[PDB]
Amino acid sequence: HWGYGKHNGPEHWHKDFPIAKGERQSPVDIDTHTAKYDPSLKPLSVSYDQATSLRILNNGHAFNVEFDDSQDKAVLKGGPLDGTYRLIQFHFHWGSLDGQGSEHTVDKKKYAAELHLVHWNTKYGDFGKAVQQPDGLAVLGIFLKVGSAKPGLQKVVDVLDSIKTKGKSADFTNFDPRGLLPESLDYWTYPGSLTTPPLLECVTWIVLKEPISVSSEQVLKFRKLNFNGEGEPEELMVDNWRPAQPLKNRQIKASFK
Numbered sequence: 001h002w003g004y005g006k007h008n009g010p011e012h013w014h015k016d017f018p019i020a021k022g023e024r025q026s027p028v029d030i031d032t033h034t035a036k037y038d039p040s041l042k043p044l045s046v047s048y049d050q051a052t053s054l055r056i057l058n059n060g061h062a063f064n065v066e067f068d069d070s071q072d073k074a075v076l077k078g079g080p081l082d083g084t085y086r087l088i089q090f091h092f093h094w095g096s097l098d099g100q101g102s103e104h105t106v107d108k109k110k111y112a113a114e115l116h117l118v119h120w121n122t123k124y125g126d127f128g129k130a131v132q133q134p135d136g137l138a139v140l141g142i143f144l145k146v147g148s149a150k151p152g153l154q155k156v157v158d159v160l161d162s163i164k165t166k167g168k169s170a171d172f173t174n175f176d177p178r179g180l181l182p183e184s185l186d187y188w189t190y191p192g193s194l195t196t197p198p199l200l201e202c203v204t205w206i207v208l209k210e211p212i213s214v215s216s217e218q219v220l221k222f223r224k225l226n227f228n229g230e231g232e233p234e235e236l237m238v239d240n241w242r243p244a245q246p247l248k249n250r251q252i253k254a255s256f257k
């Protein structure tokens with residue numbers, strides 16, 4: 001099934017998911033010179049004080065930190081959005097080396113990794129219904145550069161040994177995602193898609209301008225994860241990023257001058 005090898009990676013996905021060649025696919029390259037400042041954009045409202053993390057899962061593609069999304073406890077609002085979007089999970093994409101790993105690029109620059117905080121529009125009731133709608137999801141994307149450690153990341157890094165292989169989970173309560181945010185909430189936004197199959201065109205992307213810094217040691221621990229299941233040939237979970245897709249008939253808008 002789909003993955004990130006030679007035989008099953010991004011360049012193959014269209015055969016099972018023809019929307020891979022669609023009009024609003026993600027990620028994209030962000031051309032900072034052509035993204036226009038939109039004064040009508042609002043500040044983003046990230047309200048994570050009541051967030052309830054529950055579990056961390058290796059799904060064979062990344063690891064997900066899952067939240068209780070049965071009430072409006074961690075929500076994203078404002079920005080480009082109408083209405084309220086509940087946090088369901090976050091996950092990352094990363095490289096085999098520090099010079100690649102992000103999905104979005106900035107003037108063709110690849111970051112070492114990219115964090116995706118996935119939220120669904122409460123007007124649709126549940127995640128599965130929301131992904132069927134063009135305004136169903138809001139994904140907050142945050143770039144990771146290698147430098148100083150991110151203290152708030154370390155709890156995640158240190159549990160990864162317990163979820164080495166596909167289908168492993170571990171309890172992961174009381175994790176505060178605020179510790180993964182940069183200082184500024186300046187952002188770019190555009191309409192796009194899930195970046196893994198089924199590649200549904202249901203996402204308002206909000207990509208923060210300011211990266212977070214993580215240490216080399218932190219990203220090295222991401223790269224010890226496995227795509228494979230327990231006792232299968234080990235294949236390191238690295239390069240689990242989809243490359244930039246054609247922008248087509250879209251505009252990327254900036255919240256900032």
Ligand SMILES: O=C(O)Cc1cccc([N+](=O)[O-])c1
Nearest residue numbers: 116118139194195196197198
């Ligand atoms: O790979 C999946 O399981 C599908 C999926 C589910 C939730 C968010 C997603 N995203 O692209 O941000 C993709």
Ligand SMILES: [Zn+2]
Nearest residue numbers: 092093116195
């Ligand atoms: Zn993602």
